Write a protein that binds this ligand. Sequence first.
Ligand SMILES: [Mg+2]
Ligand SMILES: [Mg+2]
Ligand SMILES: [Mg+2]
Lengths: 127, 94, 197, 117, 101
Amino acid sequence: FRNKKQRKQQVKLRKPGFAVAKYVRMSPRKVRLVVDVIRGKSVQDAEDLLRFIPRSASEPVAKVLNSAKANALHNDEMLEDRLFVKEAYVDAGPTLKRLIPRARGSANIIKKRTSHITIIVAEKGNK
Amino acid sequence: IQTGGKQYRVSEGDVIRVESLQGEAGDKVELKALFVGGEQTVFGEDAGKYTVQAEVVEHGRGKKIYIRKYKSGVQYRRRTGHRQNFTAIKILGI
Amino acid sequence: AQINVIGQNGGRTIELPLPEVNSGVLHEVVTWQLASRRRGTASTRTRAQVSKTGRKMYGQKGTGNARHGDRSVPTFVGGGVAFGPKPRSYDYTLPRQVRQLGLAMAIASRQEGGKLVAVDGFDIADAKTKNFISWAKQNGLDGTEKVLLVTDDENTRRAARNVSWVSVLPVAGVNVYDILRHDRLVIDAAALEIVEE
Amino acid sequence: PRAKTGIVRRRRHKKVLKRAKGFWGSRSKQYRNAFQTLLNAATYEYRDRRNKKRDFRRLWIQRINAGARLHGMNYSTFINGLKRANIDLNRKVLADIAAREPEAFKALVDASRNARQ
Amino acid sequence: HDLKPTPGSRKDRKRVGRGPGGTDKTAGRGHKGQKSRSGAGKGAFFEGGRSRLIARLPKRGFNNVGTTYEVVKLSQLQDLEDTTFDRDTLEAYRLVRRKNR
RNA sequence: GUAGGGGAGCGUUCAGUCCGCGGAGAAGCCAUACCGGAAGGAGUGGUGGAGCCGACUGAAGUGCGGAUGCCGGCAUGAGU
RNA sequence: AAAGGUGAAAAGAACCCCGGGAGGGGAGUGAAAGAGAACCUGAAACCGUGGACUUACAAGCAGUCAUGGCACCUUAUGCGUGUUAUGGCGUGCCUAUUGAAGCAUGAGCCGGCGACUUAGACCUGACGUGCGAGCUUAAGUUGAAAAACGGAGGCGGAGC
Ligand SMILES: [Mg+2]
Ligand SMILES: [Mg+2]
Ligand SMILES: [Mg+2]
């Protein structure tokens, strides 16, 4: 094993079949709805469903899935016909705050929330 | 029990209140108030005819409890620690 | 009640503070020395006044949840300091008699192990430092102990710099803190040491 | 000098927060409510310490006239006999006998009936 | 090297009764100091007055500041101190000194 | 046992003195069933990546749940 | 007003993949990229994903004590630790009050900020030390990686 210092140079820390769309200008809540259908499904169903879910979050999500697919293949040399959505989740990016005017002189703050859409693909393996 | 037990037991190492007789051995005798050690169902003073011997095993302190006291709107809060002193005794007796 | 090193072998004089020294009185003295040396330069805009901020706000009533007059108060971030430190002294005149009994009692404690009176450093020659090392080595001054050299002679002084070793003190300007601070006292100049009144 | 809070508060806060283990909602998550919950728990802790001492005697008393009645007696009556037969000072663990050893419990019922009549 | 205590600057102990700690207003929760209404807050109210006995009592007076003499007892000169001479300069050196009186 | 009076101490920063520790891993953070009569304090592991415990004495901008308290971040109402 | 921080050195990431891009994954640099330019640590509120135990006849200041069920053994197998079912008990906190769960006040939550101080040759008391029928110096002067000098004056000493 040695000590931490050595471990850091010996083992270099990998992200197999992981992709992330950081700072996506959409609300987590809203984006989650789409991701929620795609989770657990086989990367091909995931691909096909996304093309028909009539939500604008579909485009962002679908893109992450293709990055996760490409990464799984090209970088990690995984088997395409075995890929499935092992994990997908939407985490909250930083909020774009904006000042909206209301009646009688008072102001308000619009929260233009952002998303961190991460999807991780893996090979199935029943056996 | 209320210190100084009784009853037909099968020679177990039970924990009771402090016994003064430090370290191992020490040896303690108990009056006995009921028994079935030989199917004979005898109780009270007729049980005193018999006496159980037990050897002192370990002197100890109990698990740490915390005395917490509280009274509302009278600003009263009290936190104090407590640990109960004991003696472990291995029963042998007649 | 002690002997000399080079240039003679007298000593014997001085009535030392009874019984076997009171740390209490030495403590009274050390605290005072340290208090006097302290320069109270307390950086603080204590006053809701001293800090840079306007004078009125958001009306007494109405606003709907508030009650404030200024942005300068201590309850405000950026505002003044309720009771912060302002500049001051801590210096006081410790009774004369107690200062006398002070270093007398301090010397007394070194006169129970690590004391030393010297008459001239013929051993030195120039400044050299290398030669003070020599001189001190012969007198059991290896460097294991912190030594306080109190000499009225300018050239033995120039041979005092060095590590967990020597601190040089001039024209009998002796200090109760300075002697208690070091392991040994090289009382040297027998001017303050022996003959008084 | 300036003596800032840094560390003192957080340590004290995390302490209270850790007493709140399986407390519902905010009670295990926000300090103010966690600490607040514990004051009420304090009342409960001191009380229940001497309250359990009433609880068990009652459970024991219950198992007693359950057996005493099984042999045509009752608690009031059965304990009076065992008092009259001075020799019997059992009192504590007289319920274990009633629960685990019926044969042995009968012996005590029989002995109580005598010292009484 | 072993762990050593050693006397000196690190061994200059307090003096048992020398200096106690000040009052810091929090001895449990149940310290919300001063009183509990009216004689709490700012700095004033007073501790003297101008009717609370004083006014209601008499005199016009007349204060003087005449001649005040420094006392020299018989007992000072007699018993001890054999005629060390009084004079005008040797009277001070004994211990019965003031000037201006 | 409320106001209040009296006593003994825990903790923080700074200082002086002593004893040490640290890139073969400092502080800080995180987890923990151990210890102490309390404030509290250790052991171990994890994270961090360069400073720092312990003891004695000195000094304070020294301990927060409240003040329609101040600053900041983030919730609810609501996918309305 | 608010705003600080890569790395020892820019060696500031050529090249490949998904994408219009953003963003990411690799390759390489580096001790570390568990430092990548939204660059030291990175608490808490708050948002998720995964796992354990659980929950659709239940009346709930949300705990507490007792017991049973499941689960886990890194201050940890006599014990515990986490969770759960049922039973008993149980009127948030602060403030203000004769009287607060009160349908009286305050507070969305967390973090940090935030309230008995300082001055004075002032008065009076406790404690401690130094001298002691005596006790002290002030301004200042001289030294100062340091203290000495300075009795002008102040207090006790007699009262009416
Ligand atoms: Mg400022
Ligand atoms: Mg608050
Ligand atoms: Mg009102």
